[PDB]
Design a protein around this motif. Sequence first.
Motif, PDB file in Angstrom:
ATOM      1  N   UNK B 266      -2.409  -0.761 -28.430  1.00 10.98           N
ATOM      2  CA  UNK B 266      -1.122  -0.808 -29.436  1.00 10.98           C
ATOM      3  C   UNK B 266      -0.313  -1.802 -29.135  1.00 10.98           C
ATOM      4  N   UNK B 267      -0.125  -2.764 -28.452  1.00 11.30           N
ATOM      5  CA  UNK B 267       1.634  -3.803 -28.899  1.00 11.30           C
ATOM      6  C   UNK B 267       0.096  -4.493 -29.808  1.00 11.30           C
ATOM      7  N   UNK B 268      -1.166  -4.750 -29.932  1.00 14.63           N
ATOM      8  CA  UNK B 268      -1.226  -5.423 -30.882  1.00 14.63           C
ATOM      9  C   UNK B 268      -0.597  -4.523 -32.373  1.00 14.63           C
ATOM     10  N   UNK B 269      -0.876  -3.235 -32.645  1.00 13.83           N
ATOM     11  CA  UNK B 269      -0.474  -2.763 -33.417  1.00 13.83           C
ATOM     12  C   UNK B 269       1.526  -2.139 -33.026  1.00 13.83           C
ATOM     13  N   UNK B 270       1.826  -2.751 -32.502  1.00 12.51           N
ATOM     14  CA  UNK B 270       3.177  -3.236 -32.337  1.00 12.51           C
ATOM     15  C   UNK B 270       4.305  -3.983 -33.118  1.00 12.51           C
ATOM     16  N   UNK B 271       3.593  -4.937 -32.729  1.00  4.32           N
ATOM     17  CA  UNK B 271       3.740  -6.568 -33.079  1.00  4.32           C
ATOM     18  C   UNK B 271       4.668  -6.549 -34.134  1.00  4.32           C
ATOM     19  N   UNK B 272       6.224  -7.251 -34.106  1.00  2.00           N
ATOM     20  CA  UNK B 272       6.983  -7.577 -34.820  1.00  2.00           C
ATOM     21  C   UNK B 272       6.385  -8.800 -35.468  1.00  2.00           C
ATOM     22  N   UNK B 273       6.456  -9.099 -37.049  1.00  2.00           N
ATOM     23  CA  UNK B 273       5.966 -10.103 -37.707  1.00  2.00           C
ATOM     24  C   UNK B 273       7.160 -10.996 -37.448  1.00  2.00           C
ATOM     25  N   UNK B 274       7.247 -12.263 -38.153  1.00  2.00           N
ATOM     26  CA  UNK B 274       8.256 -13.316 -37.918  1.00  2.00           C
ATOM     27  C   UNK B 274       8.747 -13.266 -39.723  1.00  2.00           C
ATOM     28  N   UNK B 275      10.263 -13.245 -39.394  1.00  2.00           N
ATOM     29  CA  UNK B 275      10.461 -12.786 -40.590  1.00  2.00           C
ATOM     30  C   UNK B 275      10.525 -14.011 -41.983  1.00  2.00           C
ATOM     31  N   UNK B 402       6.931  -5.420 -25.291  1.00  2.00           N
ATOM     32  CA  UNK B 402       5.731  -6.466 -25.704  1.00  2.00           C
ATOM     33  C   UNK B 402       4.735  -8.162 -24.698  1.00  2.00           C
ATOM     34  N   UNK B 403       5.952  -7.758 -23.736  1.00  2.00           N
ATOM     35  CA  UNK B 403       5.875  -8.249 -22.548  1.00  2.00           C
ATOM     36  C   UNK B 403       6.754  -8.429 -21.188  1.00  2.00           C
ATOM     37  N   UNK B 404       6.135  -8.874 -20.249  1.00  2.00           N
ATOM     38  CA  UNK B 404       7.144  -8.360 -18.882  1.00  2.00           C
ATOM     39  C   UNK B 404       6.494  -9.745 -18.062  1.00  2.00           C
ATOM     40  N   UNK B 405       7.582 -10.567 -17.506  1.00  2.00           N
ATOM     41  CA  UNK B 405       7.975 -11.896 -16.799  1.00  2.00           C
ATOM     42  C   UNK B 405       8.060 -11.060 -14.858  1.00  2.00           C
ATOM     43  N   UNK B 406       7.631 -11.318 -14.483  1.00  2.00           N
ATOM     44  CA  UNK B 406       7.595 -10.821 -13.175  1.00  2.00           C
ATOM     45  C   UNK B 406       6.708 -11.578 -11.745  1.00  2.00           C
ATOM     46  N   UNK B 407       6.903 -11.170 -10.498  1.00  2.00           N
ATOM     47  CA  UNK B 407       6.939 -11.960  -9.278  1.00  2.00           C
ATOM     48  C   UNK B 407       5.617 -11.850  -8.427  1.00  2.00           C
ATOM     49  N   UNK B 408       4.563 -11.979  -8.068  1.00  2.00           N
ATOM     50  CA  UNK B 408       3.562 -11.321  -6.975  1.00  2.00           C
ATOM     51  C   UNK B 408       4.009 -11.166  -5.657  1.00  2.00           C
ATOM     52  N   UNK B 409       4.865 -12.386  -5.383  1.00  2.00           N
ATOM     53  CA  UNK B 409       5.381 -12.020  -3.789  1.00  2.00           C
ATOM     54  C   UNK B 409       6.685 -12.752  -3.547  1.00  2.00           C
ATOM     55  N   UNK B 410       7.445 -12.651  -2.796  1.00  2.00           N
ATOM     56  CA  UNK B 410       8.596 -13.208  -2.947  1.00  2.00           C
ATOM     57  C   UNK B 410       8.847 -14.716  -3.093  1.00  2.00           C
ATOM     58  N   UNK B 411      10.712 -15.013  -3.931  1.00  2.00           N
ATOM     59  CA  UNK B 411      10.660 -16.097  -4.251  1.00  2.00           C
ATOM     60  C   UNK B 411      12.060 -16.661  -3.742  1.00  2.00           C
ATOM     61  N   UNK B 412      12.200 -17.989  -3.473  1.00  2.00           N
ATOM     62  CA  UNK B 412      14.011 -18.453  -3.511  1.00  2.00           C
ATOM     63  C   UNK B 412      14.662 -17.905  -4.484  1.00  2.00           C
ATOM     64  N   UNK B 413      15.606 -18.648  -4.679  1.00  2.00           N
ATOM     65  CA  UNK B 413      16.351 -18.198  -5.779  1.00  2.00           C
ATOM     66  C   UNK B 413      15.943 -19.451  -6.732  1.00  2.00           C
ATOM     67  N   UNK B 414      16.909 -21.292  -5.954  1.00  2.00           N
ATOM     68  CA  UNK B 414      16.720 -22.000  -6.763  1.00  2.00           C
ATOM     69  C   UNK B 414      15.435 -21.934  -7.089  1.00  2.00           C
ATOM     70  N   UNK B 415      14.021 -21.752  -6.627  1.00  2.00           N
ATOM     71  CA  UNK B 415      12.630 -22.850  -7.026  1.00  2.00           C
ATOM     72  C   UNK B 415      12.854 -21.766  -8.264  1.00  2.00           C
ATOM     73  N   UNK B 416      12.583 -20.101  -8.737  1.00  2.00           N
ATOM     74  CA  UNK B 416      12.662 -19.849  -9.095  1.00  2.00           C
ATOM     75  C   UNK B 416      13.146 -19.903 -10.566  1.00  2.00           C
ATOM     76  N   UNK B 417      14.767 -20.395 -10.746  1.00  2.00           N
ATOM     77  CA  UNK B 417      15.107 -20.859 -11.445  1.00  2.00           C
ATOM     78  C   UNK B 417      14.896 -22.072 -11.664  1.00  2.00           C
TER      79      UNK B 417
END
Lengths: 4, 478
Positions: B266-275, B402-417
């Motif tokens: 589904x995601x491949x067929x939804x791809x937006x091409x570069x200008x 199209x994509x989602x970045x996330x975390x598998x467990x808990x993390x501190x603010x400073x290091x995730x920044x």
Amino acid sequence: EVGR
Amino acid sequence: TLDLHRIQRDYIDLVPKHWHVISLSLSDGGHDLCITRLQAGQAPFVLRLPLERAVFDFHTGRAELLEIIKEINRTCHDSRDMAGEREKWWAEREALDQRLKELLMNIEHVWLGGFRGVFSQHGRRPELLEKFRAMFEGVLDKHLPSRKVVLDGNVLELFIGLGDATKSGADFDEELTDLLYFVVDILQFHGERNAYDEIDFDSMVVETMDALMAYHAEANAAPESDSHAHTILVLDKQLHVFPWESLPCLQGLAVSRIPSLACLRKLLLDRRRSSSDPRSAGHHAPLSGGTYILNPSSDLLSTQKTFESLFSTHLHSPNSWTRIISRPPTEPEFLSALTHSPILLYFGHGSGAQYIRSRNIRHLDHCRATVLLMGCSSAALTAKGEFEPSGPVWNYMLAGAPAVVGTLWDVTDRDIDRFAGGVLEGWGVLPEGCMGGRNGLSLVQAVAKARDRCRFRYVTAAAAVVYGIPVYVDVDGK
């Protein structure tokens, strides 16, 4: 550091 | 076997050839790791690895992982509590970092062993492979008894995938042994019988290694251009909790996850091409018109300090970004951002689920946004480490993000920044040098490199994962  | 080829035709042959797909699942018993390698224009490869072939089975590995995670989570949430005591808190986390590093080493060494090459992104070269085949079959003739059954190229590619055999100090002895047993078993399976004790394995390792040196010498002399190769993982329900991307053999390589082949297609067929080329294979998200949500609960003062001026200068002002700072977004605002912004940045606690209902992410016509959830356990694994249809991320995937970045467990603010700043520079959302010219890695490539920015590669960076397909920033696009 603070837990987010 | 019939079914698999229907999958090849209707799903895999649509996947860009510079990408390959690996699914990971367990045998009914739990005794075997089942690995399937899929690539357009390639024969499917199916691998079944008994974890105990050599005190450390899957139950044991998963148990150790979950306990470590429990303790890590405990450390983020103490952070505040400890008032002297500061030294002890750090010592606890570094030690967990070391424990998780060790666990992943043991997984690569024991479970995968000499089969780690299945994850190799090396370019296939038929002419060189035919040379290796000839030498390796020679090895077989010379050292076996029953001194007819011919091996599939995919099996030989496992040998190649162990890495550059010409590297100074390279030692593949256990791995090569492991793979030679495999070959003897395949032969055995296909009607060529051989007693283990009647084979001189130690000589075969030596001759095979020399054969691999011959291969890589030739390969090194003539190297192909950069493929911008990406691996996409399909993971069984209980395997999402494992930070596969942080295994030694996948570390630094562009690896994402996808909930299913249906998603992928589904995601491949939804791809937006570069200008406006391997980069044209990814989804392209314009830089203009994104949304960022920064410190929605107002207590992440350190985080706001880090990004506020940068986002103002580089995003809101020149690129028409929507700015939400130190206030919760209303749910319609959140939904509207998902519909209209090519990129959504969430720098807050958790998954943002406190601000937007799961059931409402499903009502969305289309999730246009590529979504970065920079918060604790934003992948929303179960207490038992499972990936369930009710988390925010699954919902984004169903809506078509199209994509989602996330975390598998808990993390501190400073290091995730640190990680987040890394993603944004590498991805080209921010200019090079910001955190201390504009880069253009895929989102998947930018995530893999940005793990380097964390103080803890395992306690923090190994938590970071991407669900979806490679996304490139399209700076002049609209």
